């Protein structure tokens, strides 16, 4: 249990760092549509 | 623009999405880990 | 081998869990919208 | 509603891109727990 | 640490191998429906 | 057809986006391998 624990460990302090990336890229993407919404009008 | 809208409605629900899936992600590896930790 | 072979096993589980997490929630927000586009009409 | 249809559509197609993805993955996943197990 | 790095290289490895098969997945999707769109017209 | 075009959006929209957040995944596991390698 405790290779499987070390294991599990690390994957969750991966996956929080990947979720945070992922939520910034999806923002900025969002905040760049809604910027180009605008310019058209 | 239509297609810009379009397009940040299909990206803002993904981002909804993403947010509250990281968080079920994130509860269910602290969840394992306490398991394996207390051998339960 | 051994160790990565348990690691493996471990995020197979975790993976299996999180895909039926995924598909349950984008149903729900699926079944949401299907529903208020038929309150609006 | 073209707003709520336009959002049904999207999350549909992503549901039914997930529901694909998840299978591959966990075909990834066994078969290399195979070969690990089996030293191929 | 040992532990922990031969979970992370498998699951680099694993990562690799599904970025690449979410890629592709989406691009046939992508070319699909760009097909269906010009058949309709 | 709309319908295909709305569509075809929201998943090219989703393929750009996944294409780079598998570079910034690979990136940081990478970035983390390294680091248990060096013990850093
Ligand atoms: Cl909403
Ligand atoms: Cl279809
Ligand atoms: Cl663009």
Known sequence: ER??????????????????????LFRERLSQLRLRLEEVG
Chains 1, 3, 5 share one sequence.
């Open 3 to 24: 290779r499987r624990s070390e294991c599990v460990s690390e994957m969750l302090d991966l996956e929080k760092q990947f979720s945070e990336l992922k939520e910034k």
